[model samples]
Target: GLTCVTSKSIFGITTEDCPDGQNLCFKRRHYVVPAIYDSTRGCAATCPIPENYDSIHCCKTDKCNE
Candidate 1:
């Protein structure tokens, strides 16, 4: 997806693998990979941040706020 910093400014924001296995932030959550390869929803849905969802798993990245 494109990152919109301003009303007229937007760019394609992409996530990559951490060379040293660090955290990445997305939709107010911490994760390693932003999203699953074949999941329907994004990292938030596919990877539950708190790591206690019934239908999904949490993504662990270096950007994890908590």
Candidate 2:
């Protein structure tokens, strides 16, 4: 996957198979002081951001969430 501005500070990679019935990848974004504070990416059956997060997104393409 191509690099994106939100993940510029951190540098790493991880791979995992999607869970049972989980056909999509997801990226969860967290904000603090109106800036990117934290994020996470993974595969899930039903990827969804929690109510506590500032914003979130999900995708189905290869490495799209990463």
Candidate 3:
């Protein structure tokens, strides 16, 4: 199990606990427009390849997405 930020926006963030099969903590972020960004953090079995002017990262430790 892992603890991670489940959602994020330009204003604030939210957190949650990972499900059993999702061990990897991932951060997915994308440009909403210019400096305004839309971001997401959560647990996953795998990290997706970056696309559509988006970026991603993965980690193994609890709450590492911060």
Candidate 4:
């Protein structure tokens, strides 16, 4: 079983056991309204490509999101 981070904050470490058909991933994004940096790490069945983010990163491995 693969382990994946499962949180939506920039300064925290949360993880969970990946489901039978899930993949581990991490997302990095930015907001323009007030200029803020956002990030989220978690397991997903399927991660889609983003277009409105300054940057977005994806990975599928145990602790690879970290």
- Taken over the whole model, the C-alpha lDDT of each candidate is 0.31, 0.62, 0.82, 0.70
Return the candidate ranking by lDDT, descending.
Answer: 3, 4, 2, 1
Q: What TM-score does each of the candidates earn?
A: 0.21, 0.66, 0.80, 0.67
Q: lDDT for model 1, on a 0 to 1 scale?
A: 0.31
Candidate 2 residue lDDT tens string, 1-66: 322222323465666655567777777767755654677677766767566745668777667775
**Clash total of candidate 4:** 0
Candidate 3: list runs displaced more than 4 Å.
9-12
Q: Write the residue-wise lDDT of candidate 4 on 1-66 in tens digits.
A: 778777745466788898878865666565657766666567777775666756767787787777
Worst 10 residues of 4 by lDDT: 23-32
TM-score-wise, the better of 1 and 4 is 4
RMSD (Cα, Å) for all candidates, in order, is: 12.4, 5.0, 1.8, 2.6
Measured by lDDT, the strongest candidate is 3
Candidate 3 yields a Cα-based lDDT of 0.82
Q: Give per-residue CA lDDT, model 3, range 9-38, as digits (tens).
A: 667878778888888888888898888877
For residues 1-66, write the lDDT of model 1, one tens digit per residue: 212111111333344333332232233322445472222222231333344232333345432322
